């Protein structure tokens, strides 16, 4: 750049992508000779699915295929290279950074936000854990186009503050993970984008995953759609500059599977950290199915984000990682369930409620 009137996130990303060319072309993977995947493909085609699928089996990519259009106006078809707005699934990225910071001894999950983010003052103290678990009592984040960066968003949330009746009760809230993203920035003294790339993106070779405004990936960024009235209409993201950590990231389904399988293989943490993070629920440490941006459930682990006409959903266990990205708004959950439970027949015990995982 030049004059640099940019947030820390863009500063980092612009400099990072000065000499970066467009990412490598990804090929379709689909073996019609395997009845499972033939059944899936056939289902996705006849159900008029518009988006992309990626399925990993015992760590290997066994299916990767795009259906319908990435951009309906320009006639660009969905390919394996198509990157979808993952929305609330970015909370997993932020959770991983949190866990990393805990093991680096830079934060403690039961310490309050005010400790790491002095200006974030609140009627009562809020431990980092209560943000992470969506039980802080903060009013639901009301986005604004005014907000140019993460700082303004979290400084807006601080003004709105606590809702007494909802204190120490569960309430899903993007705002929680926006505050956590700022905590990450404040303790590290570095942008969220930098923390993500240095600590996750690059180590795990996620080369088809990008923040909304990165230049070399614009070619592949999917457009989301909804019918409310007057036809199929494109829902332009207008607030992703203030949404660092709670859903301004774009991923190919393959990269999402690549991320999860590598974490499953202990590439970010040791087994004693990874196993409970991924599988322990109903315990003092991991009281809910939800933790660090994702769900550990009885038969499966789940990620999901719904944002600007897109739906990005992940069902997985130790054999399959199923990533289903939808850029025309609709019911993605019925689809991914049908694939995971009905076709792949994975409706079976996976995690055990109450057990202290080793």
Find out whether 131 and 293 touch, Cβ atoms under 8 Å.
no
SS3 assignment for the chain:
CCCCCCCHHHHHHHHHCCCCCCCCCCCCECCCCCHHHHHHHHHHHHCCCCEEEEEEECCEEEEEEEECEEECCCCEECCCCCEEECHHHHHHHHHHHHHHHHHCCCCCCCCEHHHHCCCCCCCCCCEHHHHHCCCCCECCCCCCCCCCCHHHHHHHHHHHCECHHHCCCCCCCHHHHHHHHHHHHHHHCCCHHHHHHHHHHCCCCCCCEEECCCHHHHHHECCCEECCCCCCEECCCCCHHHCCCCCCEEECHHHHHHHHHHHHCCCCCCHHHHHHHHHCECCCCCCCCEECCEEECCCCEEEEEEECCEEEEEEECCCEEEEEEECECCCHHHHHHHHHHHHCCCCCCCCCECCCCC
Closest distance of CB 227 from a second copy, Å = 4
Residue number, 22 or 48, with CB nearest to a second copy? 48
Which of 230, 345, 354, 358 binds a second copy (CB under 8 A)? It is 230
Tell which one of 22, 35, 48, 215 touches a second copy (CB under 8 A): 48
Confirm or reject binding of residue 43 to a second copy (CB under 8 A): yes
Q: Which of 303, 177, 292 is nearest to 242 (CA)?
A: 177
Which tokens is 322 given? 């199923």
Residue 142 lies near a second copy (rule: CB under 8 A) = no
- Taking CB under 8 A as the binding criterion, the range among 108-116, 214-222, 225-233, 249-257 that sits at the site for a second copy is 225-233
Q: Which is nearer to a second copy, 121 or 353 (CB)?
A: 353
Tell me: does residue 338 bind a second copy (CB under 8 A).
yes
Nearer to a second copy, 228 or 358 (CB): 228
User: Which range in 78-86, 89-97, 180-188, 223-231 contacts a second copy by CB under 8 A?
Assistant: 223-231
Question: With contact defined as beta carbons under 8 Å apart, do 175 and 166 qualify?
Answer: no
Q: Which is nearer to a second copy, 101 or 278 (CB)?
A: 278
Q: Nearest approach, Cβ of 50 to a second copy (angstroms)? A: 8
Q: Which is nearer to a second copy, 130 or 185 (CB)?
A: 130
Least separation in angstroms between CB 302 and a second copy? 9
Q: Please give the structure tokens belonging to residue 175.
A: 């705002």
Among 10, 329, 340, 343, binds a second copy (CB under 8 A): 329
Binder of a second copy out of 335, 340, 343, 346 (CB under 8 A) = 335
Of 154-162, 221-229, 258-266, 314-322, which segment contacts a second copy by CB under 8 A? 221-229
Closer to a second copy by Cβ: residue 254 or 313: 313
Task: State which of positions 96-135 bind a second copy (CB under 8 A).
Answer: none
CB of 320 to a second copy, least distance (A): 19
| Contacts of a second copy in 254-313 (CB under 8 A) | 289, 295, 304
Q: Does the footprint of a second copy cover residue 358 (CB under 8 A)?
A: no
The residue among 58 and 347 lying less far from a second copy, judged by its C-beta, is 347
Which has the closest alpha carbon to 96: 207, 10, 192, 225?
Answer: 192
- 263 close to 278: Cβ distance less than 8 angstroms: yes
Q: Is 223 in the site for a second copy (CB under 8 A)?
A: no
Residue 319: partners with Cβ closer than 8 Å, 6 or more residues away: 57, 58, 346
Interface with a second copy: number of residues (CB under 8 A): 22
Please pick, from the candidates 13, 153, 249, 328, the single residue that binds a second copy as defined by CB under 8 A: 328
Can you give the binding site for a second copy, defined by CB under 8 A? 43, 46-48, 50, 172, 227-230, 232, 289, 295, 304, 328-331, 333-335, 338
């Amino acid at each position: 750049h030049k004059e640099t009137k940019l947030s820390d996130n863009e500063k980092y990303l612009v400099d990072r992508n000065k000499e970066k060319v467009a990412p490598s072309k990804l090929k379709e993977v689909y073996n019609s000779k395997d009845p499972k995947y033939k059944k899936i493909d056939k289902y996705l085609q006849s159900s008029l699915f518009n988006g992309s699928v990626a399925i990993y089996e015992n760590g290997k990519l066994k299916m990767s295929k795009g259906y319908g259009y990435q951009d309906f106006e320009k006639g660009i078809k969905n390919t394996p290279n198509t990157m979808f707005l993952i929305g609330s699934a970015q909370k997993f990225s932020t959770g991983l950074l949190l866990k990393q910071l805990e093991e680096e001894h830079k934060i403690n999950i039961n310490d309050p936000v005010s400790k790491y983010l002095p200006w974030f003052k609140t009627s009562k103290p809020i431990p980092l854990k209560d943000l992470m678990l969506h039980q802080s009592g903060l009013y639901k984040y009301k986005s604004s186009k005014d907000y140019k960066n993460l700082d303004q968003a979290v400084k807006a949330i601080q003004k709105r503050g606590i809702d007494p009746k909802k204190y120490k009760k569960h309430m899903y809230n993007d705002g929680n993970y926006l505050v956590l993203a700022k905590v990450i920035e404040e303790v590290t003294g570095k942008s969220y984008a930098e923390n993500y790339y240095t600590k996750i993106g690059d180590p795990l070779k996620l080369q088809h995953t990008a923040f909304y405004d990165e230049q070399p990936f614009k070619k592949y960024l999917a457009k989301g759609y909804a019918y409310n009235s007057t036809g199929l209409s494109f829902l332009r993201p207008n607030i992703l500059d203030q949404y660092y950590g709670a859903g301004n990231l774009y991923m190919t389904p393959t990269d999402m599977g690549k991320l999860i399988t590598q974490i499953q293989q202990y590439k970010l943490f040791s087994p004693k950290i990874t196993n409970p993070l991924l599988h322990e629920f109903g315990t003092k440490q991991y009281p809910d199915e939800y933790r660090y941006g994702f769900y550990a459930k009885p038969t499966l682990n789940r990620l999901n984000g719904g944002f600007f006409g897109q739906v990005f959903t992940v069902y997985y266990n130790d054999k399959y990682v199923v990533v289903l990205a939808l850029n025309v708004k609709g019911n993605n959950e019925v689809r991914i369930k049908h694939i995971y439970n009905d076709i792949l027949k994975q409706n079976k015990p996976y995690n055990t409620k109450g057990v202290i995982v080793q």
